[PDB]
């Protein structure tokens, strides 16, 4: 869950960060889930930090599903350059999120362990989150 293997157009217009989650608002694979309540970017490197924390905290226990994939590339201009002269080069890959977009899913592990793991993941992550269970009823 790091980078797209290939993209057609490598320099792209930045994403819209205003509105609500187009989809992925439900726990489908796992049992418990973690959704977001604000809307920032995710940079293919903070989710890496988060899945490590969760996985290593479960001690290779139950399964994990990352629901957010970093698709959008972003650019940064070289240091101390003036304005103009083209667009800069790719610095990282991102995936915008929206309030209500589930991010991580877990199953095959007790409820309290899952809540603790998703808590520890939440702090390595730049968006306010919430703990959710597989919606039923």
């Amino acid at each position: 869950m790091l980078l797209p293997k290939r993209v057609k157009y490598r320099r792209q217009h930045r994403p819209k960060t205003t509105g609500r989650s187009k989809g992925g608002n439900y726990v489908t694979f796992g049992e418990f889930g973690l959704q977001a309540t604000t809307t920032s970017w995710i940079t293919s490197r903070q989710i890496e930090s988060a899945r490590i924390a969760m996985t290593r905290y479960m001690k290779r226990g139950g399964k994990v599903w990352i629901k957010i994939f970093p698709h959008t590339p972003y650019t940064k201009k070289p240091l101390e350059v003036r304005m103009g002269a083209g667009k800069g080069a790719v610095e990282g890959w991102i995936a915008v999120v929206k309030p209500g977009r589930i991010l991580f899913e877990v199953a095959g592990v007790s409820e309290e362990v899952a809540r603790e793991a998703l808590r520890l993941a939440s702090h390595k992550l730049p968006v306010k989150t919430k703990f959710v269970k597989r919606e039923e009823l």
């Binding site: 608002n25 439900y26 959704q35 309540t37 309030p99 209500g100 919430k130 959710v132 009823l137």
Partner: protein, 94 residues
């Protein structure tokens, strides 16, 4: 399985709908064999109690006017953040 409802009326604006949802009730519609397209609203808590009482599927008595309609939930809407039910669809079997 003896839930009751109330009959919706025409041109319920955004403000009316959102006020109605902000109180302990939720709009819905019924359709299917044996009836017509009647738009009603139900109190959320009793809907939830009935559903946990009967489950996903249940031939439910539904209170409209004076007539009770054998009805089951075709399908429903939910708001994941601010947990609250949004719109219930009902089909009658009879």
């Amino acid at each position: 399985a003896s839930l009751k409802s109330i009959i919706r009326q025409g041109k319920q604006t955004r403000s009316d709908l959102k006020q109605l949802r902000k109180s302990g009730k939720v709009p819905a519609v019924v359709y299917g064999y044996g009836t017509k397209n009647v738009s009603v609203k139900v109190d959320e808590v009793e809907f939830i109690k009935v559903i946990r009482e009967v489950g996903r599927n249940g031939v439910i008595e539904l209170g409209v006017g004076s007539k009770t309609i054998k009805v089951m939930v075709a399908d429903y809407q939910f708001d994941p953040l601010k947990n609250q039910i949004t719109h219930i669809d009902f089909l009658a079997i009879n």
